[PDB]
Symmetry: C2
């Protein structure tokens, strides 16, 4: 049988590597109620400029536009991979997403941005992403579902949030502010890396069992659709920094950071690199990995 065929017996697991992703979530388990944002409200109110206040506010709004919602992809991966492993993997990932949405919802409530979130569809750059995301995940056919799994793992889990993650973390590393928010973002970015790595694993298993599925047309659509994401997210970075340039982080460094992460995801699934970022370009955000590790414990 294949990965798309239903197996009734619980164990032995046909894909026991699922446990490596679920155990990783279990070991990193966290809830936002372990975090109090009182000190972050005071640094935000007193020690942040308007350009920095807008950078944090539009960052969290852009993340919550995708994350604060009913995300049903992972919770329903058993419908396409009818294995007891992937039901456990999806349930573990779906519960993680509910913890994330509650963490983002609390951030918007504590900082007083619930009103802007309900009217976030009044921003043009947001609807352009909603329209873009409303063409990259429309097959949420096993082969049109797998390319949707590709575009879900490279975007929703790996690069459509991480540029905003780095903006929030930059205030803690370079300014020492927003340390509790950076605590939550660090824990989330670890969960999101486990989600993306789990998607890469499933994609490679489909390639290990169905190598014909990765034909020339599918690779051409993935690389084309990925190139459109950066044109969309570069305009979002413009809207995030709409009140001006800030000292903690630069937009040009975020774009190369976004390009580097995409190529790293394409490498792990044997898809040709698109941008080939230079060392002197992506090392500007090389601090992101160690900053996630610092704000983790």
């Amino acid at each position: 049988m294949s990965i798309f065929d239903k197996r009734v017996n619980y164990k032995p697991f046909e894909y026991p590597e699922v446990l490596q992703f679920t155990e990783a979530i279990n070991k990193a388990y966290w809830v936002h109620t372990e975090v109090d944002f009182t000190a972050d409200t005071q640094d935000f109110h007193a020690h942040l400029s308007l350009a920095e206040k807008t950078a944090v506010k539009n960052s969290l709004l852009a993340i919550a536009q995708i994350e604060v919602a009913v995300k049903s992809f992972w919770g329903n991966i058993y419908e396409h991979f009818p294995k007891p492993e992937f039901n456990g993997l999806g349930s573990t990932f779906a519960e993680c997403e509910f913890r994330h949405s509650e963490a983002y919802s609390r951030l918007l409530e504590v900082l007083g941005y619930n009103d802007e979130f309900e009217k976030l569809l009044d921003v043009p750059v947001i609807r352009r992403r909603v329209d873009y995301l409303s063409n990259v995940l429309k097959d949420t056919d096993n082969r049109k579902y797998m390319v949707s799994l590709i575009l879900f793992s490279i975007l929703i889990e790996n690069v459509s949030l991480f540029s905003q993650f780095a903006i929030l973390l930059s205030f803690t590393r370079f300014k020492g502010y927003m340390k509790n928010v950076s605590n939550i973002i660090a824990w989330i970015s670890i969960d999101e890396q486990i989600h993306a790595n789990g998607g890469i694993y499933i994609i490679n298993k489909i390639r290990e069992e169905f190598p014909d599925y990765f034909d020339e047309e599918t690779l051409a659509l993935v690389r084309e659709t990925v190139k459109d994401s950066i044109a969309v997210e570069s305009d979002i970075l413009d809207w995030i920094f709409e009140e001006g340039e800030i000292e903690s982080i630069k937009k040009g460094d975020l774009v190369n950071f976004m390009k580097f992460r995409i190529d790293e995801s394409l490498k792990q699934i044997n898809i040709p690199v698109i941008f080939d970022v230079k060392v002197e370009d992506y090392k500007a955000l090389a601090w992101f990995e160690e900053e996630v590790f610092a704000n983790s414990l």
Copy 2:
């Protein structure tokens, strides 16, 4: 706009009490990898009789028949109650059921009963409950009293009895106590949706009790008290939403709520 209509916006929560059950699950979070069953294997092999081994074996097998499987009920409650709270409640309970199925799978492996679980459908007593739960559940009312309660709680008491009276299987009792706390939250979560809405099971479960003690009854627990303890938990859950038990009939199994807390921490 009722509970079966899809409210698109995430917050505010129409049913904010959902967070009471998810946080209780979050606070009681646990995995079977925290527990080592080496001390339980030595007591099982040396200090338990054949009737006690069979009681523990068939207890675990009876629980595993329902819990070691793909349980798509809670994971799909958003398709019937399209609210962001219930998708969060369903996902929280669904993940918890995977931690349970993995814990039971480890118990079957640690006690060496994997081949017995493969051939569990050879048991005519197991086939009767499979066919009973088949036409039934063809739902939430039945699901929260059956799967989420005393279709497991009687077998939970059989396992916990060895620790209270004989001091054995303390690590298994750790797993079973944590599971019973999670199951109690799952039942209260189903009852919540049920009062926000607002006989055949006992004969089948008594046959399973006959099969659990097929090699003879044991010292730590008796079948007759289990049926009354079963009869208590059924009506006491019906009060929240038929087998009136006298209290000196059921308080023979009232240490359960006490032994669960002693093995929780």
